[PDB]
Symmetry: C2
Subunit: 214 residues, 2 copies
């Protein structure tokens, strides 16, 4: 089973990953890890990657596709793999197909921007420990306070409604054509594409995936 899991930054698609790994006996792959690991164990590619990163340059799609084709080449990817958030663009998806890397399913985990904004802006944290609290969800037992230390909660620069709304627009303008690319690949019959309403309770999303994947 080779699956591509797409979802907005903050949509919560990872919630369903452990489930997918445990059902199919496949590992989860992200290009970020993949890069950190290849540099570590100096291989040709990882040496090429390490150089670019050290020079403050962006890694070429050319390197990334080679590292993926290299990774999925292992024993652990015998049963398949769960590629988390890659590809990010059509040339990357195309480059994957040309190198013969095919996937059975492309799952788009869908949560509305308003709901993602909500899940994020209403988030408090105990600065000194990074302990998270969420005003509507998991509030601190003691309002505005760290149940443990007692010390008052702060908000992360990153969870600002403005910053959050910018990430989303960017994400959407980047991902829209890729989604269209996949839906047609599916119409073509080269893969299966599925949207997953991630607003549902986790147990229902899980049931939805079992129905979608077999």
């Amino acid at each position: 089973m080779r699956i591509i899991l797409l979802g907005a930054p903050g949509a919560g698609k990872g919630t369903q990953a452990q489930f997918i790994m445990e059902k199919y006996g496949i590992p989860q792959i992200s290009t970020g890890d993949m890069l950190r690991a290849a540099v570590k164990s100096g291989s040709e590619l990882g040496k090429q990657a390490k150089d670019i990163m050290d020079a403050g340059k962006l890694v070429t799609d050319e390197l990334v596709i080679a590292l993926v084709k290299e990774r999925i080449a292992q024993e652990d990817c015998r049963n398949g793999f769960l590629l988390d958030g890659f590809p990010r663009t059509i040339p990357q998806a195309d480059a994957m197909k040309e190198a013969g890397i095919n996937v059975d399913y492309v799952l788009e985990f869908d949560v509305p921007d308003e709901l993602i904004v909500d899940r994020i802006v209403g988030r408090r944290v105990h600065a000194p420990s990074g302990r998270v609290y969420h005003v509507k969800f998991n509030p601190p037992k003691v309002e505005g306070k760290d149940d443990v230390t007692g010390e008052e909660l702060t908000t992360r620069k990153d969870d600002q409604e403005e910053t959050v709304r910018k990430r989303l627009v960017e994400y959407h303008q980047m991902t829209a054509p890729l989604i269209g690319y996949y839906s047609k690949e599916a119409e073509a019959g080269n893969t299966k594409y599925a949207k997953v309403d991630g607003t549902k309770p986790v147990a229902e999303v899980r049931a939805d995936l079992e129905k979608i994947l077999g």
Copy 2:
């Protein structure tokens, strides 16, 4: 002892790094290493940087200076540090100053473009082993053939003359004003700048370094 080590790609400034660490008891910090270390140790900035990398986004100067301030705060930098190839621009250098990160020395490891071009374009490699030869410097016994397998050698894409000469121009247009920035600073008495002839015997360069650093 706080030293910034500058040098064109291919000049071999790394050759004198062990000496510097061994003489002053300071570590080598490079942004690629530092980044890859913030992520792992899920600290506030590390998390910020892990997402950026993972999203295939480029790390902003702002986040980079933050990792350097965090990093050099580690106890292993209690004697100073060797910052290898960073800053890369006046904007980056100026920010380090503003954050209170002063440096005693800025060394520019100098090796003429042509010599670097010659040191690189003329190298053949045995792909499935990584063995490297240089038509002039370390030719294979059977020229054009790998000595251990009797298998043909190749040239890396990077080693290509067109690619090499482009990297160097790119490097020079970018580093020319930084060098100039650091000389004005040196003249202002804020740091010491020194140019090192990297075309000398390693033993001579090392000798020179001691007469510059003490």
